[PDB]
Amino acid sequence: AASGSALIFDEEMSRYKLLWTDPECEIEVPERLTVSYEALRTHGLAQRCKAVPVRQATEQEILLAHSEEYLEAVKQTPGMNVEELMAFSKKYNAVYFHQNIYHCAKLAAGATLQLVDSVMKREVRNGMALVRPPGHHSQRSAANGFCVFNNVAFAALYAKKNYNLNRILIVDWDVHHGQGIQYCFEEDPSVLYFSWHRYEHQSFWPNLPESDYSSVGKGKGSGFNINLPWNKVGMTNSDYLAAFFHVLLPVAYEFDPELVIVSAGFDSAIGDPEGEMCALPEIFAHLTHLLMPLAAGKMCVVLEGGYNLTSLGQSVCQTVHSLLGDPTPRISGLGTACDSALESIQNVRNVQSSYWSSFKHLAQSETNIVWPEPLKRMPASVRTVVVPPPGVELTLPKNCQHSISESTAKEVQRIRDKHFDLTDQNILRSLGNIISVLDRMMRSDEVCNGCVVVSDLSVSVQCALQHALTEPAERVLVVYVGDGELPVKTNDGKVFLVQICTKETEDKCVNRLTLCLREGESLTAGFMQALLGLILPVAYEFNPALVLGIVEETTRLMRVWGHMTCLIQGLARGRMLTLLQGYDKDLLELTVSALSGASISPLGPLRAPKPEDVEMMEKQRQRLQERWGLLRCTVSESW
Numbered sequence: 001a002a003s004g005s006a007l008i009f010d011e012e013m014s015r016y017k018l019l020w021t022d023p024e025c026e027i028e029v030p031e032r033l034t035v036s037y038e039a040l041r042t043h044g045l046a047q048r049c050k051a052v053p054v055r056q057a058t059e060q061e062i063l064l065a066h067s068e069e070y071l072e073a074v075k076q077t078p079g080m081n082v083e084e085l086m087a088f089s090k091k092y093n094a095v096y097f098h099q100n101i102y103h104c105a106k107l108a109a110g111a112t113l114q115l116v117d118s119v120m121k122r123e124v125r126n127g128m129a130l131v132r133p134p135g136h137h138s139q140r141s142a143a144n145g146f147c148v149f150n151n152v153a154f155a156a157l158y159a160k161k162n163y164n165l166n167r168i169l170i171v172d173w174d175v176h177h178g179q180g181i182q183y184c185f186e187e188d189p190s191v192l193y194f195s196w197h198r199y200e201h202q203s204f205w206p207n208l209p210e211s212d213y214s215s216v217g218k219g220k221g222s223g224f225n226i227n228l229p230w231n232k233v234g235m236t237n238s239d240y241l242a243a244f245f246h247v248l249l250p251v252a253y254e255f256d257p258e259l260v261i262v263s264a265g266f267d268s269a270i271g272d273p274e275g276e277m278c279a280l281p282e283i284f285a286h287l288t289h290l291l292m293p294l295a296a297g298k299m300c301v302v303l304e305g306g307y308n309l310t311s312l313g314q315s316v317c318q319t320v321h322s323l324l325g326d327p328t329p330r331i332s333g334l335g336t337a338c339d340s341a342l343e344s345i346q347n348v349r350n351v352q353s354s355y356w357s358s359f360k361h362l363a364q365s366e367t368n369i370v371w372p373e374p375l376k377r378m379p380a381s382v383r384t385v386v387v388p389p390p391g392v393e394l395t396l397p398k399n400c401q402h403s404i405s406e407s408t409a410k411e412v413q414r415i416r417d418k419h420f421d422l423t424d425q426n427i428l429r430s431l432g433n434i435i436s437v438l439d440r441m442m443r444s445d446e447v448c449n450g451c452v453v454v455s456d457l458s459v460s461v462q463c464a465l466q467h468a469l470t471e472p473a474e475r476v477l478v479v480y481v482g483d484g485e486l487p488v489k490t491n492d493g494k495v496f497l498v499q500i501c502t503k504e505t506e507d508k509c510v511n512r513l514t515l516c517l518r519e520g521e522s523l524t525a526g527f528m529q530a531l532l533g534l535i536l537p538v539a540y541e542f543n544p545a546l547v548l549g550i551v552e553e554t555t556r557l558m559r560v561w562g563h564m565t566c567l568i569q570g571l572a573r574g575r576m577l578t579l580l581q582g583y584d585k586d587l588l589e590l591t592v593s594a595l596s597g598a599s600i601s602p603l604g605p606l607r608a609p610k611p612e613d614v615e616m617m618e619k620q621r622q623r624l625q626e627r628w629g630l631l632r633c634t635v636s637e638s639w
């Protein structure tokens with residue numbers, strides 16, 4: 001399978017700039033490109049990437065999204081002097097031209113097609129193109145908003161034509177609306193376009209009615225355009241993650257795209273003079289990670305905007321870090337989205353209820369400036385540590401490894417004489433392994449996560465949890481697939497327990513989330529809704545120091561454990577410990593693969609979730625959203 005991350009870049013795209021006074025355009029500078037590449041270099045990230053060279057887009061490739069009359073017109077700008085270039089620029093809105101911009105636009109476009117080819121030929125897992133000019137505002141017959149040609153529109157059309165893809169997702173997390181992309185695929189259901197953008201009730205450029213949440217596409221494309229307008233500035237990490245958990249990801253996983261292309265503008269990060277939002281560069285590490293389980297990880301990131309030269313480099317680094325599979329930074333201080341964001345989320349969910357499974361219940365009323373620096377994200381020396389039953393030899397990826405100390409031995413003796421009596425030296429060995437892997441995870445920073453097969457749950461769980469809390473792990477998220485009770489106290493706020501089980505239990509405290517899913521062909525789509533809309537919002541708000549996965553011997557959800565294992569590594573710097581009760585080489589091989597950063601195989605189509613399951617999930621939201629506001633996807637009613 002594929003490996004590596006492409007970084008397509010070329011200094012030549014910094015060799016055009018604005019040649020006259022124009023405050024509308026003067027933020028779009030060559031240094032945007034040189035600052036981001038140097039930031040990747042400083043942090044050792046450009047060196048870890050497969051460099052792929054740029055090429056020019058050909059004429060036939062430009063004509064996939066643009067008219068001959070507009071190409072012929074742009075093709076004449078290399079011969080223009082400055083007076084003629086200003087006059088040509090004024091025929092369009094918020095855009096300037098340069099003797100060399102036609103040359104660089106073909107390079108930005110060709111660079112994008114290079115990244116599609118490398119990803120679709122499996123020569124790399126994923127990648128990023130650092131390009132100028134941006135593309136997402138550019139239209140069939142017009143330059144607009146610093147954009148000459150629509151790089152990301154090309155990528156989607158090119159990938160349709162030359163790889164016969166039927167389902168491509170475009171995520172535009174730039175702070176501006178990519179109307180050029182919207183127009184190009186408005187009637188196209190094979191390309192799903194999601195955009196969030198500063199809108200402020202249409203007072204913010206480009207001041208377009210069709211950038212509102214009510215633009216869902218046209219004709220056969222109805223439902224495949226999703227606009228999320230931001231109507232106030234100052235949106236934070238919590239707003240962005242609310243948008244992902246309750247709008248984008250539910251549609252994205254149900255759509256099941258065969259390729260993901262990000263219009264990656266970082267004018268949506270704190271410090272940017274255009275966006276005026278407050279999301280930290282670290283959020284982009286997670287926006288990236290949250291989408292990587294789609295399309296077997298085949299993600300093409302294309303640079304759009306981002307104009308604060310400091311926020312810019314930091315955010316490019318967080319994105320590539322995640323593309324390379326480095327551990328995600330912990331996001332603290334998360335909570336409810338602001339009211340304007342909940343209103344926008346509310347509205348787009350309701351208008352899209354006609355078209356998408358996760359929102360379908362919302363339709364029938366039987367249901368209804370300075371900031372701190374990002375800390376270093378080092379890949380752990382060996383990512384994953386596996387402890388199969390003694391004697392069971394397995395073939396592991398290059399970043400996995402098998403397992404005891406003298407200190408670990410005395411600790412197990414100490415634990416045994418105090419709390420457990422217990423003589424089985426096999427159980428006593430799992431306890432010795434649990435301690436040692438945790439010590440390597442929590443203290444060394446040389447190991448990231450791990451999986452240990454165990455015999456008895458009640459002793460190994462209790463031992464793993466208690467030992468983790470003194471590592472110290474201020475907070476532990478526990479995810480348990482199984483029935484019955486675990487030696488897990490959720491009374492003091494140090495521990496949150498997610499329990500996927502079969503028998504509907506009593507809702508206890510607000511530190512438990514219990515999901516009893518009706519068995520059948522529904523279990524997979526039901527589980528993925530709960531994961532994106534319930535498990536991840538709480539977990540992200542809880543911000544644990546360690547994740548403890550636990551699976552009972554009692555297969556039925558072999559198909560979703562990989563996605564959860566992948567997505568839950570957004571928490572706790574990827575530090576997860578999975579206890580598997582009983583040997584099952586299929587589940588253990590899947591756990592290790594996802595844990596080690598391997599590409600996750602797609603889910604494909606699934607029977608829509610059962611109404612009883614959706615009803616069960618919304619009862620959990622109502623019960624928990626007052627404590628865990630990141631669960632909110634409506635505005636709260638005031639007293």
Ligand SMILES: CN(CCCC(=O)NO)CCNC(=O)c1ccccc1
Nearest residue numbers: 024094145174176205265273274305
């Ligand atoms: C800059 N240009 C389009 C940006 C292209 C882009 O970044 N696309 O992704 C015009 C819109 N910007 C503003 O109206 C503005 C003025 C003052 C303060 C904050 C905002």
Ligand SMILES: [K+]
Nearest residue numbers: 172174176196
């Ligand atoms: K956008």
Ligand SMILES: [K+]
Nearest residue numbers: 185188191224
């Ligand atoms: K579309």
Ligand code: NA
Nearest residue numbers: 089090092094
């Ligand atoms: Na102008």
Ligand SMILES: [Zn+2]
Nearest residue numbers: 174176265305
């Ligand atoms: Zn922008």
